[PDB]
Amino acid sequence: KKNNQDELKKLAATEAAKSITTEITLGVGTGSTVGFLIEELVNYRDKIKTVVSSSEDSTRKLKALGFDVVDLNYAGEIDLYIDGADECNNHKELIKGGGAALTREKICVAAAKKFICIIDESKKVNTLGNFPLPIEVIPMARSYIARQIVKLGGQPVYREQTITDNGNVILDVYNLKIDNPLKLETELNQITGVVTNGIFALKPADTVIMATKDSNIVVL
Amino acid sequence: NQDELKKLAATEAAKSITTEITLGVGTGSTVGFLIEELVNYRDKIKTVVSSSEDSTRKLKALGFDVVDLNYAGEIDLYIDGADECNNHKELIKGGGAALTREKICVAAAKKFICIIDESKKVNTLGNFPLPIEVIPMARSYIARQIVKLGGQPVYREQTITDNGNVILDVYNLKIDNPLKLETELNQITGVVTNGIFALKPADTVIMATKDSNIVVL
Numbered sequence: 001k002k003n004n005q006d007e008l009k010k011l012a013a014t015e016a017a018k019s020i021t022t023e024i025t026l027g028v029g030t031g032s033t034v035g036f037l038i039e040e041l042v043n044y045r046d047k048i049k050t051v052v053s054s055s056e057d058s059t060r061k062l063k064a065l066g067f068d069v070v071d072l073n074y075a076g077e078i079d080l081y082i083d084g085a086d087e088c089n090n091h092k093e094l095i096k097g098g099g100a101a102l103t104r105e106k107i108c109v110a111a112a113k114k115f116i117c118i119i120d121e122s123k124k125v126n127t128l129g130n131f132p133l134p135i136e137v138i139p140m141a142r143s144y145i146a147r148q149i150v151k152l153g154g155q156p157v158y159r160e161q162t163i164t165d166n167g168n169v170i171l172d173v174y175n176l177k178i179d180n181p182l183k184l185e186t187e188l189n190q191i192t193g194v195v196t197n198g199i200f201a202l203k204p205a206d207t208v209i210m211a212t213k214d215s216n217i218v219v220l
Numbered sequence: 221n222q223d224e225l226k227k228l229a230a231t232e233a234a235k236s237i238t239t240e241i242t243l244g245v246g247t248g249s250t251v252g253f254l255i256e257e258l259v260n261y262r263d264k265i266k267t268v269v270s271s272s273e274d275s276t277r278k279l280k281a282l283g284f285d286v287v288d289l290n291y292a293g294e295i296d297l298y299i300d301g302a303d304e305c306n307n308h309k310e311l312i313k314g315g316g317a318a319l320t321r322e323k324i325c326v327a328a329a330k331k332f333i334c335i336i337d338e339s340k341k342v343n344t345l346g347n348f349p350l351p352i353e354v355i356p357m358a359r360s361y362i363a364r365q366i367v368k369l370g371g372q373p374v375y376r377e378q379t380i381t382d383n384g385n386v387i388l389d390v391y392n393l394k395i396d397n398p399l400k401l402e403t404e405l406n407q408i409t410g411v412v413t414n415g416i417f418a419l420k421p422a423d424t425v426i427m428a429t430k431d432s433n434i435v436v437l
């Protein structure tokens with residue numbers, strides 16, 4: 001089952017790489033699906049002028065393949081950003097942050113002309129929520145924010161032994177009714193001490209490449 | 221002169237420590253005079269929470285044990301300074317870089333008392349540049365978004381906040397609607413905290429006048 005899923009991830013990542021057509025500033029996401037993209041990037045080395053990374057994990061992987069990684073402040077604007085997602089609904093709105101890089105991932109999406117999301121079918125849903133929503137919080141505010149999330153009906157679970165690239169901690173929130181991703185993303189952004197929440201809806205994916213169980217490509 | 225008014229305001233605020241409480245302590249020079257005054261209320265202060273390592277250091281130097289907010293829970297009273305305070309007790313804070321934890325403390329406090337001298341009282345917030353704590357990676361992106369709004373962002377060099385972030389001090393903002401702009405700035409990706417304290421304003425503001433009187437707003 002895991003070898004099967006890995007095959008679909010590789011298909012989706014490989015397909016997304018074809019969009020690297022011209023000389024561009026490429027932004028690179030985080031996760032296992034992105035891991036197969038990073039490997040594929042060797043075949044597009046002459047097209048990739050500058051690389052920006054959403055995580056030290058991906059940076060480590062990119063540098064290991066000889067790619068120079070440039071800070072977003074010196075790169076400026078990203079032409080194309082490619083990243084995975086934990087969930088994707090019918091309007092290309094995502095839950096992300098399963099691998100903890102959600103802050104820099106959201107910053108990269110914000111500074112990108114175009115955002116392509118690469119998934120296998122298991123991540124496609126009609127309604128976001130079943131996968132617990134990651135929220136990056138200032139360590140000092142963890143208990144306060146946990147309480148505010150309990151008021152909303154969510155059940156926050158502190159992800160132990162995890163410190164994000166930015167020095168923060170993650171709350172994974174269960175039992176949320178997320179029928180209005182736009183509204184709740186806005187809501188969570190107003191809670192003091194929240195750095196970033198895992199809903200990618202205000203600025204959704206421009207294209208979502210999904211590998212089906214039959215090894216076909218669906219472009220949503 | 222200004223130091224005298226700061227001490228008066230801080231001393232006055234300390235009188236509100238009446239019962240056994242969890243006290244939250246702000247940051248800055250005005251708060252510095254409060255911390256000194258807290259020796260005279262040692263039996264009333266059960267637990268202390270600090271909005272900065274600077275204040276924590278000062279508190280520990282006076283023998284006060286400082287407890288993390290996660291183990292303290294809820295603060296009964298939080299006392300802090302401000303860079304500006306308008307007519308509706310809405311503040312600009314973050315001149316001393318502790319604005320994130322200061323805002324968290326205010327959010328978790330039953331009551332927030334702000335201590336100022338008269339020089340910080342204004343009719344309209346904005347003249348003092350608005351501090352905004354941002355994720356280092358997003359600094360250039362956020363600077364551009366602030367330029368679109370008409371602000372002029374200046375990176376505060378050689379400053380890394382307690383939380384590992386950097387500060388943009390923003391000039392030329394028209395802040396006639398603090399509530400609206402605070403909400404707006406919170407939606408900009410990469411912004412950790414902005415220096416407007418309006419959505420949850422001060423409950424009481426103690427202001428020392430030029431004539432050394434106390435005005436309770």
Ligand SMILES: O=C(CO)[C@H](O)[C@H](O)COP(=O)(O)O
Nearest residue numbers: 031032033084097098099101
């Ligand atoms: O947002 C992310 C990291 O925080 C990833 O894109 C996603 O959460 C995990 O991707 P995968 O399931 O392919 O490993």
Ligand SMILES: O=C(CO)[C@H](O)[C@H](O)COP(=O)(O)O
Nearest residue numbers: 248249250301314315316318
């Ligand atoms: O917000 C603050 C720290 O970030 C301070 O409360 C504010 O800068 C006032 O300081 P002072 O009393 O020294 O003028």
Ligand SMILES: [Cl-]
Nearest residue numbers: 146156157158
């Ligand atoms: Cl928790």
Ligand SMILES: [Cl-]
Nearest residue numbers: 077361364365
């Ligand atoms: Cl821009």
